[PDB]
Amino acid sequence: DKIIHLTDDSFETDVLKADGAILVDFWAEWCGPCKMIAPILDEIADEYQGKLTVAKLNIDQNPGTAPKYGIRGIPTLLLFKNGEVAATKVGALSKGQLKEFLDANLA
């Protein structure tokens, strides 16, 4: 609803040429902790309305993008600000932990 479902070809417009912050989630369907954080990202998309957009890139359906950011372990959350990565988070985390990651790095 508020989340951008990204693709390899839409990555530049959606993330790189966006005028503000984008929390990108690199994930896969077989990844248990990815699925664990997905309902949390829904909550974040809603709560951070006007501060950032949440965007998801499935690394199997869109295989091209993740090598460009050195992604290995998933889920990987990259906070982009105006096309540049500001903050990196690897592995699963709680809602309360994500908030702290966001609040600290959004300043």
Swiss-Prot record:
GO terms for cellular component: cytoplasm; cytosol. The active site is at C31 (nucleophile), C34 (nucleophile). InterPro entries: Thioredoxin, Thioredoxin-like_sf, Thioredoxin_CS, Thioredoxin_domain. The record marks G32, P33 as: Contributes to redox potential value. The keyword Metal-binding does not apply. SUPFAM superfamilies: Thioredoxin-like (SSF52833). Residues 1-107 form the Thioredoxin domain. The record marks D25 as: Deprotonates C-terminal active site Cys. The keyword Acetylation applies. Participates in various redox reactions through the reversible oxidation of its active center dithiol to a disulfide and catalyzes dithiol-disulfide exchange reactions. This is Thioredoxin 1. The lineage of its organism: Bacteria, Pseudomonadati, Pseudomonadota, Gammaproteobacteria, Enterobacterales. The gene is trxA.
